[PDB]
């Protein structure tokens, strides 16, 4: 599909003597997957600012990052003054809530409802955190969304962000079936999925003991995908974290139920997919 | 209180050339605290047999011990034939459910109801697993119960088990307020609480980040014992595991709610108290 045409801006590599840690703005953070991947790659983080509403996700971040995260409330409360007073950013990330962007809803409300239009909030903060002309600072940005969108919606998003959406499927690097569009200007945006041997490709490596995988991988019949003691059992939450690439026992931070952990892990990013995406940032920024 | 009088049987120490791994019968296992403590002390376990009813506790054991546990169902299904066919045991452990043994109930049903009389099931399996006369094999046993019992109940239990109940309070070695009676014939049954520096004595060492302990320790006002972001918050389950001496994120094994994790962790043993109790077994049995 060639509807628009624009070259991706490739920044020159900075040497090690002018190497600086990253300043990261994370708009729709949720479960703090971005800072988790950044800490796993061994990258020094000078400032991480997450604008999260949901208190369970804020609790996930406060437990798993120990007060490193600077919290904002709603993204509508962020102005241009808040962007220009919190220093210039080096990495902007986010994925808008796809309640009305997904075409799996028969009665979907579209891009221009209060769940979808938050994307434009992103664009506004994309417009504020972007450096002006004449500044050769390497500025990188990343937007995530689902594959189940309309043609006009994806076309308008691609025109607004001015980048080619690469499609990445979790089955090439992890044990999940979800294809996601990624807008951004990272180097090697469409390079193939370098599967890490430490990543759990099959489903059975993500299971616990005493459980047999019925399928080869899981999706995002009135049965259950795991047999347990010759009985079909629901897929566990820690096993869901191992499928989604998270560390073991990650989203157990408060007194939330099983349904809350499902709602948090469903909306979260895939750790291996991000690790692939954030990989070339290591040569552009600080290392630890 | 000197109502009965009997000397504790002290077994001779076996040297290292005749040293064998342990065979453990665990009647009212629940959360597998005994085998956890045994693996933490570095003791080779040849056979561990847990007779547990509740499927959540069986799931805890299957996750945290990887099929090492031989499961029986109800303790009433165990006969003398099952004891004599599963080899002679070296350590028998258990704590009966104190639904009717506790005097915190105003309408308590007593020792001789189906929650209390399961203790006698223990005694029956204590009678079957005990070696006959002439056998100098070191056989050890341990029964646990709450402090809130009647005088006649504790007297009858002490007469039936023929041992002096030592009282151990969790506050001397951990951050919990519970005193428990321990019947048994382990060496150093009433030696004082050797507090380990690796054990978390204070409550604040068991908390996560961003939470301030209101009290010095927790119990087993319409307020909450932990402030979180200048707001009173319920004590977390993983923090409850850190209080009770369990490893971090221990009882997160299936899709159980907060109330199920409370019901499992409440009935469970205190890991440091057991570690103290199981400590002298290291010189009588195998080491790893
Ligand atoms: N107006 C808003 N501003 C900021 N966050 C919002 C928001 N509305 C909802 N959220 C929260 O932000 C998250 C966006 S949903 C997708 C999250 C993202 N894919 C991830 O990496 O986890 C949701 O968890 C939702 O609870
Ligand atoms: N008849 C029975 N036989 C075996 N287990 C039983 C039982 N009835 C109840 N149980 C279970 O056995 C446990 C006894 S309650 C106390 C458990 C013990 N203090 C511990 O170390 O965890 C409870 O979790 C209960 O679910």
From Swiss-Prot, chains A, B:
* Enzyme active site: 98
According to the UniProt record, what happens if one changes residue 159 to Q? In TBRS; uncertain significance
Outcome recorded upon mutating residue 137 to C: In TBRS; somatic mutation
Location of S-methylcysteine modifications: 98
Q: Where in the cell is it found?
A: Nucleus; Chromosome; Cytoplasm
- Residues that hold S-adenosyl-L-methionine according to the record: 29-33, 52, 74-76, 267-269
Ranges of residues in domain SAM-dependent MTase C5-type:
22-288
Tissue expression as described in the entry? Highly expressed in fetal tissues, skeletal muscle, heart, peripheral blood mononuclear cells, kidney, and at lower levels in placenta, brain, liver, colon, spleen, small intestine and lung.
Reported modifications of this chain: Sumoylated; sumoylation disrupts the ability to interact with histone deacetylases (HDAC1 and HDAC2) and repress transcription. Auto-methylated at Cys-98: auto-methylation takes place in absence of DNA substrate and inactivates the DNA methyltransferase activity. Inactivation by auto-methylation may be used to inactivate unused DNA methyltransferases in the cell.
Substituting residue 278 to S results in: In TBRS; somatic mutation
Q: What is the effect of changing residue 36 to P?
A: In TBRS; somatic mutation
Cite the effect that the entry attributes to residue 280 to L: In TBRS; somatic mutation
Q: What does changing residue 88 to L do?
A: In TBRS; somatic mutation
Specify the domain of life of the species encoding this protein. Eukaryota
Q: What is known of its domains?
A: The PWWP domain is essential for targeting to pericentric heterochromatin. It specifically recognizes and binds trimethylated 'Lys-36' of histone H3 (H3K36me3).
The disease tied to this protein in UniProt is: Tatton-Brown-Rahman syndrome: An overgrowth syndrome characterized by a distinctive facial appearance, tall stature and intellectual disability. Facial gestalt is characterized by a round face, heavy horizontal eyebrows and narrow palpebral fissures. Less common features include atrial septal defects, seizures, umbilical hernia, and scoliosis. Leukemia, acute myelogenous: A subtype of acute leukemia, a cancer of the white blood cells. AML is a malignant disease of bone marrow characterized by maturational arrest of hematopoietic precursors at an early stage of development. Clonal expansion of myeloid blasts occurs in bone marrow, blood, and other tissue. Myelogenous leukemias develop from changes in cells that normally produce neutrophils, basophils, eosinophils and monocytes.
- Sum up the protein's function in the record's words: Required for genome-wide de novo methylation and is essential for the establishment of DNA methylation patterns during development. DNA methylation is coordinated with methylation of histones. It modifies DNA in a non-processive manner and also methylates non-CpG sites. May preferentially methylate DNA linker between 2 nucleosomal cores and is inhibited by histone H1. Plays a role in paternal and maternal imprinting. Required for methylation of most imprinted loci in germ cells. Acts as a transcriptional corepressor for ZBTB18.
Q: Give the quaternary structure.
A: Heterotetramer composed of 1 DNMT3A homodimer and 2 DNMT3L subunits (DNMT3L-DNMT3A-DNMT3A-DNMT3L). Interacts with UBC9, PIAS1 and PIAS2. Binds the ZBTB18 transcriptional repressor. Interacts with SETDB1. Associates with HDAC1 through its ADD domain. Interacts with UHRF1. Interacts with DNMT1 and DNMT3B. Interacts with the PRC2/EED-EZH2 complex. Interacts with MPHOSPH8. Interacts with histone H3 that is not methylated at 'Lys-4' (H3K4). Interacts with SPOCD1.
Family of this protein: Belongs to the class I-like SAM-binding methyltransferase superfamily. C5-methyltransferase family.
Q: What's this protein's name?
A: DNA (cytosine-5)-methyltransferase 3A
Part of the intact protein present: 613 to 912 of 912
